């Protein structure tokens, strides 16, 4: 029944926040205010 | 078994790809300084 254990999926969303913040942070730093 | 519903999770991975190409397209096109 869906295995009710989406561990990997949860791993991807975590990576999602890290993705947006990683590239967004990169441009932010380069922009320098 | 339970509700859980790992559907939204799948939706997030899709969003992950969107983030990669979105920011990547932004910086590649013309990273504002």
Swiss-Prot record, chains A, B:
**Binding residues annotated for Ca(2+), in chain numbering:** 16
In the record, the effect of residue 15 to L is given as: Does not significantly alter the formation of homotrimers or homotetramers
Which consequence is recorded for altering residue 7 to L? Does not significantly alter the formation of homotrimers or homotetramers
Record localization:
Cell membrane
What does the UniProt entry list as the effect of changing residue 16 to A? Reduced cell surface expression of KIR2DS1. Severely impairs formation of homotrimers and homotetramers. Abolishes interaction with TREM2 and stabilization of TREM2-CTF. Impairs the expression of KLRD1-KLRC2 on the cell surface
Report the outcome of residue 16 to N.
Reduces formation of homotrimers and homotetramers
Site feature (Important for interaction with transmembrane receptors) residues: 20
Q: In which tissues is it expressed?
A: Expressed at low levels in the early development of the hematopoietic system and in the promonocytic stage and at high levels in mature monocytes. Expressed in hematological cells and tissues such as peripheral blood leukocytes and spleen. Also found in bone marrow, lymph nodes, placenta, lung and liver. Expressed at lower levels in different parts of the brain especially in the basal ganglia and corpus callosum.
Tell me how the protein is altered or processed after translation. Answer: Following ligand binding by associated receptors, tyrosine phosphorylated in the ITAM domain which leads to activation of additional tyrosine kinases and subsequent cell activation.
Membrane-crossing ranges are 7-27
User: Organism's domain of life?
Assistant: Eukaryota
UniProt function note: Adapter protein which non-covalently associates with activating receptors found on the surface of a variety of immune cells to mediate signaling and cell activation following ligand binding by the receptors. TYROBP is tyrosine-phosphorylated in the ITAM domain following ligand binding by the associated receptors which leads to activation of additional tyrosine kinases and subsequent cell activation. Also has an inhibitory role in some cells. Non-covalently associates with activating receptors of the CD300 family to mediate cell activation.
Summary of subunit composition and partner proteins: Homodimer; disulfide-linked. Homotrimer; disulfide-linked. Homotetramer; disulfide-linked. Homotrimers and homotetramers form when low levels of partner receptors are available and are competitive with assembly with interacting receptors. They may represent alternative oligomerization states or may be intermediates in the receptor assembly process. Binding of a metal cation aids in homooligomerization through coordination of the metal ion by the subunits of the oligomer. Interacts with TREM1. Interacts with TREM2. Interacts with SIRPB1. Interacts with CLECSF5. Interacts with SIGLEC14.
Family to which this protein belongs? Belongs to the TYROBP family.
Linked disorder reads:
Polycystic lipomembranous osteodysplasia with sclerosing leukoencephalopathy 1: A recessively inherited disease characterized by presenile dementia along with large-scale destruction of cancellous bones. Initial symptoms, starting in the twenties, are pain and swelling resulting from cysts in the wrists and ankles. Extremity bone fractures could occur with minor trauma. At around 30 years of age, patients gradually develop neuropsychiatric symptoms, including epileptic seizures, agnosia, apraxia, speech disorder, memory disturbance, euphoria, and loss of social inhibitions.
Name recorded for this polypeptide:
TYRO protein tyrosine kinase-binding protein
Organism listed in the record: Homo sapiens (Human)
């Amino acid at each position: 029944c869906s295995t009710v254990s989406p561990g990997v999926l949860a791993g991807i969303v975590v990576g999602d926040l890290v993705l947006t913040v990683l590239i967004a942070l990169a441009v932010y730093f380069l922009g320098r205010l």
